Design an enzyme around this catalytic site. Sequence first.
Site, PDB file in Angstrom:
ATOM      1  N   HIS B  74     -19.835   3.609  13.791  1.00  0.00           N
ATOM      2  CA  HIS B  74     -20.048   2.217  13.448  1.00  0.00           C
ATOM      3  C   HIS B  74     -19.157   1.309  13.050  1.00  0.00           C
ATOM      4  CE1 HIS B  74     -24.717   2.383  13.939  1.00  0.00           C
ATOM      5  NE2 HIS B  74     -24.142   3.035  15.158  1.00  0.00           N
ATOM      6  N   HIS B 242     -23.565  12.213  20.649  1.00  0.00           N
ATOM      7  CA  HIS B 242     -24.769  12.743  20.550  1.00  0.00           C
ATOM      8  C   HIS B 242     -25.043  14.544  20.417  1.00  0.00           C
ATOM      9  CE1 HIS B 242     -26.646   8.459  21.200  1.00  0.00           C
ATOM     10  NE2 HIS B 242     -25.835   8.812  19.983  1.00  0.00           N
TER      11      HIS B 242
HETATM   12  C1  HEM Z   1     -23.793   4.903  24.035  1.00  0.00           C
HETATM   13  C2  HEM Z   1     -24.713   3.957  23.009  1.00  0.00           C
HETATM   14  C3  HEM Z   1     -25.223   4.626  21.813  1.00  0.00           C
HETATM   15  C4  HEM Z   1     -26.639   4.288  21.183  1.00  0.00           C
HETATM   16  C5  HEM Z   1     -27.746   3.241  22.085  1.00  0.00           C
HETATM   17  C6  HEM Z   1     -26.855   5.117  20.278  1.00  0.00           C
HETATM   18  C7  HEM Z   1     -27.927   5.151  19.380  1.00  0.00           C
HETATM   19  C8  HEM Z   1     -28.138   6.113  18.269  1.00  0.00           C
HETATM   20  C9  HEM Z   1     -29.431   6.158  17.426  1.00  0.00           C
HETATM   21  C10 HEM Z   1     -30.390   4.887  17.856  1.00  0.00           C
HETATM   22  C11 HEM Z   1     -29.258   6.836  16.601  1.00  0.00           C
HETATM   23  C12 HEM Z   1     -30.211   7.120  15.381  1.00  0.00           C
HETATM   24  C13 HEM Z   1     -29.474   7.456  14.029  1.00  0.00           C
HETATM   25  C14 HEM Z   1     -30.703   7.689  12.944  1.00  0.00           C
HETATM   26  O1  HEM Z   1     -31.763   7.228  12.920  1.00  0.00           O
HETATM   27  O2  HEM Z   1     -30.236   8.263  11.926  1.00  0.00           O
HETATM   28  C15 HEM Z   1     -27.611   7.492  16.817  1.00  0.00           C
HETATM   29  C16 HEM Z   1     -27.253   8.401  16.084  1.00  0.00           C
HETATM   30  C17 HEM Z   1     -25.669   8.854  15.940  1.00  0.00           C
HETATM   31  N1  HEM Z   1     -25.074   8.541  17.017  1.00  0.00           N
HETATM   32 FE1  HEM Z   1     -25.496   7.399  18.536  1.00  0.00          FE
HETATM   33  N2  HEM Z   1     -25.528   5.848  20.184  1.00  0.00           N
HETATM   34  C18 HEM Z   1     -24.586   5.406  20.855  1.00  0.00           C
HETATM   35  C19 HEM Z   1     -23.369   6.000  20.966  1.00  0.00           C
HETATM   36  C20 HEM Z   1     -22.684   6.718  20.222  1.00  0.00           C
HETATM   37  C21 HEM Z   1     -21.398   7.008  20.528  1.00  0.00           C
HETATM   38  C22 HEM Z   1     -20.576   6.431  21.531  1.00  0.00           C
HETATM   39  C23 HEM Z   1     -21.323   7.834  19.291  1.00  0.00           C
HETATM   40  C24 HEM Z   1     -19.785   8.326  18.759  1.00  0.00           C
HETATM   41  C25 HEM Z   1     -18.689   8.937  19.921  1.00  0.00           C
HETATM   42  C26 HEM Z   1     -22.597   8.266  18.762  1.00  0.00           C
HETATM   43  C27 HEM Z   1     -22.838   9.144  17.680  1.00  0.00           C
HETATM   44  C28 HEM Z   1     -23.806   9.362  16.912  1.00  0.00           C
HETATM   45  C29 HEM Z   1     -24.059  10.234  15.897  1.00  0.00           C
HETATM   46  C30 HEM Z   1     -23.075  11.303  15.272  1.00  0.00           C
HETATM   47  C31 HEM Z   1     -25.188  10.035  15.412  1.00  0.00           C
HETATM   48  C32 HEM Z   1     -26.022  10.986  14.351  1.00  0.00           C
HETATM   49  C33 HEM Z   1     -26.307  10.394  12.961  1.00  0.00           C
HETATM   50  C34 HEM Z   1     -26.908  11.437  11.887  1.00  0.00           C
HETATM   51  O3  HEM Z   1     -26.901  12.622  12.451  1.00  0.00           O
HETATM   52  O4  HEM Z   1     -26.990  11.188  10.717  1.00  0.00           O
HETATM   53  N3  HEM Z   1     -23.242   7.328  19.114  1.00  0.00           N
HETATM   54  N4  HEM Z   1     -27.243   6.833  17.805  1.00  0.00           N
END
Ligand code: HEM
Lengths: 700, 700
Positions: B74, B242
Amino acid sequence: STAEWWPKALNLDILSQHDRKTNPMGPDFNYQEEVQKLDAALKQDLQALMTDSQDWWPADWGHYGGLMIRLTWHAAGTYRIADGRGGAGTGNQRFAPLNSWPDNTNLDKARRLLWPIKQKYGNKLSWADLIAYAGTIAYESMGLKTFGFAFGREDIWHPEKDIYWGPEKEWFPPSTNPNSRYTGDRELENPLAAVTMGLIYVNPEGVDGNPDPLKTAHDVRVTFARMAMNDEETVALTAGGHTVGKCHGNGNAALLGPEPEGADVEDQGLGWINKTQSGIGRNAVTSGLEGAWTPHPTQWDNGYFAVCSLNYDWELKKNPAGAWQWEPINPREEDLPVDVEDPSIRRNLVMTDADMAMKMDPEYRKISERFYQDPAYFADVFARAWFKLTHRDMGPKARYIGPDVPQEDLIWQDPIPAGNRNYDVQAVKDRIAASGLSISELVSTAWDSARTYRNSDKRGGANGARIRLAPQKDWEGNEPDRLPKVLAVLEGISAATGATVADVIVLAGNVGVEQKARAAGVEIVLPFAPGRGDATAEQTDTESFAVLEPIHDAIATGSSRTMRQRLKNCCLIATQLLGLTAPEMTVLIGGLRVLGTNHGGTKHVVFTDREGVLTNDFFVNLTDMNYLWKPAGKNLYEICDRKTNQVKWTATRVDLVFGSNSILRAYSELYAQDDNKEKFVRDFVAAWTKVMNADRFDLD
Amino acid sequence: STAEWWPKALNLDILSQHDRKTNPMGPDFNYQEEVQKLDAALKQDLQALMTDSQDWWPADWGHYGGLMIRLTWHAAGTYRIADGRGGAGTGNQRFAPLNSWPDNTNLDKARRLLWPIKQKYGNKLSWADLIAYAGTIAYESMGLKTFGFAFGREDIWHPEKDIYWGPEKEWFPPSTNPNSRYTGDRELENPLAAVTMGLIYVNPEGVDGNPDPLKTAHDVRVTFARMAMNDEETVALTAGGHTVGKCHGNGNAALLGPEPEGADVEDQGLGWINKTQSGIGRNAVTSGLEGAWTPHPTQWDNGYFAVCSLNYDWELKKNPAGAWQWEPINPREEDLPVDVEDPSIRRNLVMTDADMAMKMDPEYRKISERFYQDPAYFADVFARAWFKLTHRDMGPKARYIGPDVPQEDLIWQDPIPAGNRNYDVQAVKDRIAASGLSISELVSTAWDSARTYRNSDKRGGANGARIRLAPQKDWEGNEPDRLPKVLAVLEGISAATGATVADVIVLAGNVGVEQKARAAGVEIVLPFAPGRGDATAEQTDTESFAVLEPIHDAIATGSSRTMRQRLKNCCLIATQLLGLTAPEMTVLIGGLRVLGTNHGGTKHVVFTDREGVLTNDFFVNLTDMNYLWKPAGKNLYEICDRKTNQVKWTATRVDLVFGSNSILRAYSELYAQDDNKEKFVRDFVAAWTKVMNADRFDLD
Ligand code: HEM
Ligand code: HEM
């Protein structure tokens, strides 16, 4: 932008104004020394400008004096005693929003007319001094013996962001509206010194535009008092001001273009330009009223009270632009002011609602009468008041420079004598150390002596050691019993040495801080400058100092009473007046807290197991997440241990904002770093020094 | 405040950010040299933090990696190619408004969890580097072979006022609303790289909250491209991201307290705190979706595509907090992620609309397939993309510091070799002087080579002499025919000397300026630093440089086409990117104008009877009231003599704003003073130098 999102947030930007990136002058540039080189006999050029009419904005009767006096008057008329903000000390009229206030209509022309002179004298003549001097020279040229003038006002380069001008989000609205600055029964919101937004003091047509000289008189008395002027000075100023010049309202107003800040680039930074029809000369429209107060408006005389306001009877009329104004009944032809372009045509006399108030208000009427029958008095009282108007925000005479500075020490200057500088500082320190005064008693006393300072009008500060005088010695925030326990000791040390009580109170504070850095195993000699004088009760205006009373001081977590304003709001305002930055405000709070300096000896944010020791403990603990903060009543929180759920410390909003506000917490985190213990001490000391030396204009 | 009054006014404050009064560090403090001393084997502490759960915000399954990776993602995800603004290069997530964006919900906890480490390493570890490093170490600890990391990001102390985040005055509103950032048929307002206000790239539940993976795929492709990521990097990032962590939405959202900037002091600068019920652990609510993408979310593996998105079929469901999410049909128990507090309980899998898009969009589907059957490729492409994400706003490798900087020169870094420094500058100058190139041809060419620089992501500038390469050599604003007439000469001088074409173009500009100061009878040697290298077409990404094309440059009164933006708006934005202050912008405009440097050889604001002579003539004439300004068509004015009513000069809004804006005119007046001719030259030169040396990070 980045924040309409959270409007309740501290406006920290007011603490970072007038910085390097906005200042176009080299960093060693020093105006005081360049203006001392000015050829003040520049009086000849300014005087010549008065009769040097320019085509794009011709001089009435070939004389700009009336216009120039109004320029200066309006530049000065923005001052207010509550906080010392506003005034002519910074040349703020050349910037927003003042350059575009309705009351400053066409003063843009006046300022622009002064440019050739500013171009000629350059860096040695600030726009601030030039604007403040213009009206004085105009008066001289028109016949008035002015009292004097001092240069020394340094230029600014952008709006003074710290000044709150009022709650209205519209220009000159009625007092019976939403966002009104009026409460109860016509009770003006305290800081403010004007009846509405965009006006200097009062509405010329009457309260909310409705003519009655008696209700207008009430606003005039109230607003002028908030500007430090009493009844005599007020009648004097009003009459003396309108003894020359005129009102302009010969045309449709609606035809005027946008005020300066709202005009497009083709207007050269000017505003209120008429492009539909001629808007200059006799066709000029400014306030909207039209006519002159005296037969001979290009000259100082006794025409204001002399057949005009006192000897003719007056009635309500409407000028060509639709403004209310008073005109005389059956005036003789010789008394009619002539047309501004053609002397063979006669125009009309006028009196505003504020002028009629000088005749109708019972008290003003008596003063008006004295000036009518004793013009020598009138001219002297006016001249002095004109000088007060243009210098009431200049501060100590030490700041005054120039050949025409009056030798007389005026009470509104807060006169303070030069104190002896030859006395051996170290002997003074040892005797202080040798007394039984606590580190805490030393620091609080010095803090309190210096905290009264405000850069807005440069009043207050540790120099003349007034805290020892009424009414200061008895102010609640100054802790009257502890203050005398300390003055008694310190007054003795000063008599015994040749050092002033003022120098001693500061030096004592320095000792307290030195003792505290020593206890944290840090050796330091805080810079110091001797010379403070002790001021007398005779040269101390008890009523004018009421305004500097510390009813609030977050730096010592003190609040005299519940106030509408947030505590951090109050904290931010004192630090802006003090001239401190956010980083400076931050270390100060952290330091004073561990030195055990709260008012009333409260532990609200001590956060140390070692008071009296200068450590970065406040930040280390404020920034520690092993604790949670539980709201606990008015301006109070319980700092609890997350494991044991017990109360470790208490704290106020002033304390916790440094761990809540994202910018302040970033500073707090910095000072809580393992590697910044010495930086914290060094930075606390420098800020401490800056505060103790803020009013030292007597120094080179 | 001082101006809701005139909202159309230039926001000059963006040119005076990050100044002395806001910076808490001493003025000699130099981060680059302190971070070079950092014990990067701090990797042990960061790695330990990952499994060091804190009570006030417990780690899922005892591992903060997912949270930390999201933090970094982020912090990085805010970048956009149009202007290079946003990104993780300044640690801006710790300040408004980013610290309170809906998409950054609970990242406040992540940042706060990193504080003990920042406290430990102090001034040698900026918050910016720490936040950018966190996710990389998390990936390492979870099993991914990261590609590398570089320190070197200096901390800021307040919001980046220069970044325009979008037109909405509400958080995450539908695209079918007033103040929408969408036009025509879902055409994103150009600068912007996100689908709505407060979100990083895309809406996880679907376009405007309505689930369809195909329309979501369109937004993902568009937003990621605006962040410099192509299809492969995008699928890689999404899946790789993810592969660990989860979504949190187990509770009523409406119960969450205010975001950080809107929370009260008791919240310790944190936000989205649930005080009604438990809001931590399995009861955590963040995005609102609930579930994990893989069976083993604490470890790098092939679970994302491996039975999850590709091998199970998915259907729309609603999570406990009311958010749309995709869940698998008839998942086997072993594939269910366990509860974050108790490993013996099973919870559910999930896929967001953006994850489903990777399976449904025809093109992403093919890439998804390659990563499913070739995980070695997936891990390599992801690792590289993760590194690009965290350094795409770091600029030249010269800025990179640390033991893990990859030896590989990545194309997105704009690689430029070190040019020779031993070549005798004076011989180069004489040959330049000796050529038949005009003072004007010299200056414009150097200006154009350096003007491409932008401090937002540190790309562009005179160093590698790219202007000589496609696509730059052919950009309209660069005047292609005049540019080669000059490159031909200068390329010959460089081959003949051992100096680079880049060093020669700059040195030539310096000669033009030196010749012009000499003609005004002023002798000067402009500072200079050798070393610029010439970059190759192979190490020059023609597509990534399109974004640096000078479609507008007020400094040379050039506008490629009519644009919505005001010309002075455009001027202000280029000067903010260039790193110039208002006083600097002012002298630059005044100087370039009299040097005869307008694009197309136009006289729009020459205002001199002597082009090619470095005088303060622009200001003297702009400030002269003997002239009036008559609007004369598009971005054009006639400067007329008030006496003769004849046209003396023409000018554009870029020129006249310096005589209209109250702050800029104050600067113009200063430089038009009789006593500031030399100050103008000295100041013009210093600003010129600052621009020629802006991208010189290769220097010490
Ligand atoms: C492709 C567009 C993306 C969307 C729509 C998206 C959406 C989300 C959403 C909705 C969450 C919810 C987290 C929560 O409620 O705590 C999340 C978590 C997460 N996303 Fe994405 N994401 C995207 C791309 C990415 C990318 C590119 C990465 C990094 C290379 C990433 C890494 C993560 C990680 C590590 C979490 C985990 C948070 C946790 O475990 O506390 N995301 N993402
Ligand atoms: C007592 C409250 C006052 C009110 C309500 C008031 C009102 C006005 C008004 C409405 C004008 C119209 C000017 C125009 O239309 O161009 C004016 C002009 C003027 N006032 Fe006042 N005034 C006040 C106080 C003063 C004071 C205290 C002085 C300075 C000691 C002063 C000096 C002048 C001068 C010199 C002009 C002439 C402008 C010119 O000739 O161009 N006024 N005043």
